């Protein structure tokens, strides 16, 4: 693919419907542990080990420890220059009658914290719960999410399983439900929300410009989103520290932290 910014900036100068798809690179640049590999571990596991309905079924305490860690750690993280540039870009192009939509794979809400409005969080949120009994989805920023998790979730291996009994894990507070809560996060082996997918479809169908920022394009179906946009001929710009299995299907490929390239690229 090209690495010519002047040429990217041509299309960008005129684009009316920009779709910006983001992945864990963008969060990593804020200091958010994304447990992707080849050295993204929590104790002895990575996301694909613990972010699964099987992991949750067999050890709900350990999965809760993991997401508890990840919730707490966010207290000190801020959005980075890439987040801000995306958010200001939206605000600016907005005024000019031009559309910017963010489609994120990330569950950390940094795009929201930065000021992004048109945000599709296709894999859910660290700060939302769903009740496994009644299905209610609720925002939850509570630190700690429950008393029994106070002081738990330490990432060092060797760390002992808290083994909270399920009664003392996060429970639904809807009168007379009592159900066990889970993170409102799309796990491996689960479906994305079809209502969210239809939105994403509408956005990809109607876009004239597409950016794919800090994604390693190995997570499906999100990995198909940008290639689909390049398949109607629409230019896709990959912003990434590395090349990916998707790279040669795109128009551009800008190397480096999204924090460095995006503020230039979306000025």
């Amino acid at each position: 693919p090209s690495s010519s910014m002047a040429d990217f900036r041509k299309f960008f100068a005129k684009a009316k419907h920009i779709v910006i798809i983001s992945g864990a690179g963008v969060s990593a640049e804020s200091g958010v542990p994304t447990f992707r590999g080849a050295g993204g571990y929590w104790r002895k596991w990575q996301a694909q080990d613990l972010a699964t309905p099987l992991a949750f079924a067999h050890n709900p305490s350990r999965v809760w420890e993991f997401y508890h860690y990840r919730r707490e750690v966010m207290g000190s993280k801020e959005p980075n220059a890439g987040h801000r540039a995306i958010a200001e870009c939206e605000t600016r192009l907005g005024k000019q009658g031009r559309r910017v939509v963010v489609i994120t794979q990330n569950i950390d809400e940094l795009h929201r914290k930065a000021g992004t409005k048109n945000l599709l969080e296709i894999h859910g949120s660290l700060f939302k719960t769903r009740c496994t009994s009644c299905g209610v989805v609720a925002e939850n920023y509570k630190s700690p999410i429950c008393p029994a998790l106070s002081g738990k979730g330490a990432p060092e291996p060797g760390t002992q399983d808290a083994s909270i009994p399920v009664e003392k894990l996060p429970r639904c507070e809807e009168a007379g439900c009592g159900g066990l809560l889970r993170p409102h996060v799309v796990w491996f082996g689960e479906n994305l929300d079809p209502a969210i997918l239809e939105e994403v479809d509408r956005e990809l169908a109607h876009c004239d410009l597409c950016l794919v920022v800090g994604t390693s394009s190995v997570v499906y179906p999100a990995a198909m989103f940008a290639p689909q946009v390049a398949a109607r001929g629409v230019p896709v710009a990959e912003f990434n520290t590395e090349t990916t299995p998707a790279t040669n299907r795109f128009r551009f490929h800008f190397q480096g932290p999204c924090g460095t390239t995006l503020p230039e690229a979306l000025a």
Binding site: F188, G189, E190, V219, P221
Partner: peptide
Amino acid sequence: TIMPKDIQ
């Protein structure tokens, strides 16, 4: 036909 969330 769309598949569940997977790592390839």
